[PDB]
Amino acid sequence: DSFVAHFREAAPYIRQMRGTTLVAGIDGRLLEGGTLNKLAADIGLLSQLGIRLVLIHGAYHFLDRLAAAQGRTPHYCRGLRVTDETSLGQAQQFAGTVRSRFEAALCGSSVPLVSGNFLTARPIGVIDGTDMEYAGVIRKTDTAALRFQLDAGNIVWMPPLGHSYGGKTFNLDMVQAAASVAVSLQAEKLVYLTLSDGISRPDGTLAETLSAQEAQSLAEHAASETRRLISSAVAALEGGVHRVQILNGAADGSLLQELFTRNGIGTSIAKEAFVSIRQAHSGDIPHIAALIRPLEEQGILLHRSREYLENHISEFSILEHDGNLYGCAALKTFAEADCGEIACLAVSPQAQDGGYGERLLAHIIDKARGIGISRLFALSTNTGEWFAERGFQTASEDELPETRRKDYRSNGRNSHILVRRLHR
């Protein structure tokens, strides 16, 4: 395609990403070849786009290309490397090699890059009778010092090394470290730059987009490395990171493609928040009435009635949290088998703006599609934009199902009519 077209395509993603925090967990093998040069350039570009950037790299594989290729075997109790004094010292050497390399590649492809004593570590201790030695986990992260650097526009570079109150240095696991730092920062995004195209489905295909539940159910039959990825990704989400992404940092330009295109390569994982929505039953009616009545009083919701609701309760859905009712919505059907109507949509005023409405509309379109409905109408006197911004197109009265058209005419309400087309 054309430059202008590509750039106008990127523009909304640039808008979304600007001023947000991205923690990048970087596989240490990427900092070794000329994939390094490609990466510094793309990270330099991200810097230039107003993205706050914290980069953390791994060391394990480099240590093994020093260990294994020597006559010493690494031990990996839960993927956590046992790391002795000699391995610890190598990691310190590698971390300096790598930060220097990155800095040089960034200077030749002027972007401020900073590193500091941000992590305080503790040893993992003893996993399964096996002393883990210098394998440490982040005990405290200096969030104030980090924010202060990101705020000034600095790129933050972190090795997989933390120090302790006992004046020791510990070896950190990168995959776990990035997710920990990401949660501490409440980073909007965690990115793992791996050697893999992302997480694959049981049928072999690349999982473009996953819920944390979907991710979780895949780990049941997944290799060790990818199980740990998921575990860290899920804990990040649960800890407040908005989105976790898995990419192949060996695929030239994949970071740009992931962040700035609708399509995006790799795997994207996000947490589905908890909103129990269920078929309404008999006992819901007073809760539904109390919610609906103010609105029916205001001329926003059509007048219902204890009897209407009792005899049509099956067409209502209700949204609940801790026994508390907070929303409702009905699916009305017609002689036209293809047609449905979202009716009686309502969120308690105290619970609004937090997405509850959208979840009710979604649940009802799932229900509508479940029964063969490809066309979903909404009629509203005062609330038409909400629908128009969520996939509804203006429609005319002559377009309604015949019986609805008749109610509409005799109403006098002249409500706006919108239709959304539901895919098979």
Ligand X SMILES: CC(C)(COP(=O)(O)OP(=O)(O)OC[C@H]1O[C@@H](n2cnc3c(N)ncnc32)[C@H](O)[C@@H]1OP(=O)(O)O)[C@H](O)C(=O)NCCC(=O)NCCS
Known binding-site residue numbers for CoA = 139-140, 347, 352-355, 357-358, 380, 382-383, 385-386
Task: State the CB neighbour count (10 A cutoff) for residue 246.
Answer: 28
Binding to its own copies in span 242-271, by CB under 8 A:
252-253, 256-257, 260-261
What does the DSSP assignment read for 365-419?
Answer: HHHHHHTT--EEEEEESS-HHHHHTTT-EEE-GGGS-HHHHHHHHHH----EEEE
Instruction: For tokens 């793309």, name the residue.
Output: 42
Query: Which residues partner with 192 through β-bridges?
Result: 25, 246
Nearer to ligand X, 70 or 414 (CB): 414
Nearer to ligand X, 26 or 345 (CB): 345
Please state the residue numbers annotated as binding site: 139-140, 302, 304, 344-345, 347, 352-355, 357-358, 379-380, 382-383, 385-386, 404, 413
Task: Assess contact for 53 and 43: CB atoms under 8 A.
Answer: yes
Among 55, 95, 181, 343, which residue sits at the site for its own copies (rule: CB under 8 A)? Answer: 95
**353 scored as a contact of ligand X (CB under 6 A):** yes
Task: State the CB neighbour count (10 A cutoff) for residue 299.
Answer: 11
Q: Label the pairing between strands 52-57 and 155-158.
A: parallel
**346 scored as a contact of ligand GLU (CB under 6 A):** no
Going from the C-alpha of 283 to that of each of 37, 173, 276, 300, 380, the distances in angstroms are 64, 52, 17, 25, 28
**362 scored as a contact of ligand X (CB under 6 A):** no
Please state the residue numbers annotated as binding site for L-glutamate: 302, 304, 344, 379, 404, 413
CB of 378 to ligand X, least distance (A): 6
**Amino acid identity, position 68:** A
Binding to its own copies in span 45-84, by CB under 8 A:
45, 48-50
Among 27, 28, 39, 44, which residue sits at the site for its own copies (rule: CB under 8 A)? Answer: 44
Binding to ligand X in span 368-387, by CB under 6 A:
380, 382-383, 385-386
Among 119, 177, 347, 418, which residue sits at the site for ligand X (rule: CB under 6 A)? Answer: 347
Nearer to ligand X, 89 or 354 (CB): 354
Give φ, ψ of 417 to 5 degrees: -115, 130
**317 scored as a contact of ligand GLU (CB under 6 A):** no
Among 191, 343, 360, 418, which residue sits at the site for ligand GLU (rule: CB under 6 A)? Answer: 343
Q: Label the pairing between strands 276-279 and 316-321.
A: antiparallel
> How many Å apart are CA 207 and CA 4, to the nearest integer?
30
Question: Segment near ligand X (CB under 6 A), from 45-53, 77-85, 234-242, 339-347?
Answer: 339-347
Among 68, 75, 108, 306, which residue sits at the site for its own copies (rule: CB under 8 A)? Answer: 108
Q: What is the DSSP letter of 102?
A: H
**151 scored as a contact of ligand X (CB under 6 A):** no
Dihedral sign for Cα 41, 44, 48, 52, please: positive
From the number of C-beta atoms within 10 Å of its C-beta (0-12, 13-18, 19+), residue 119 rates as buried
From the number of C-beta atoms within 10 Å of its C-beta (0-12, 13-18, 19+), residue 219 rates as middle
**141 scored as a contact of ligand X (CB under 6 A):** no
CB of 364 to its own copies, least distance (A): 21
Nearer to ligand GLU, 52 or 332 (CB): 332
Binding to ligand X in span 190-229, by CB under 6 A:
none
Site string (303-322) toward its own copies, x via CB under 8 A: --------------------
Question: CA angle at residue 179 from 167 to 156, to 5 degrees?
Answer: 65
Among 302, 351, 362, 395, which residue sits at the site for ligand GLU (rule: CB under 6 A)? Answer: 302
Going from the C-alpha of 391 to that of each of 365, 388, 398, the distances in angstroms are 12, 6, 20
Residues at the contact surface with ligand X, assessed by CB under 6 A:
122, 139, 295, 300, 345-347, 352-358, 380, 382-383, 385-386
Q: Which residues contribute to the site for ligand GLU (CB under 6 A)?
A: 301-302, 343-344, 379-381, 413, 415
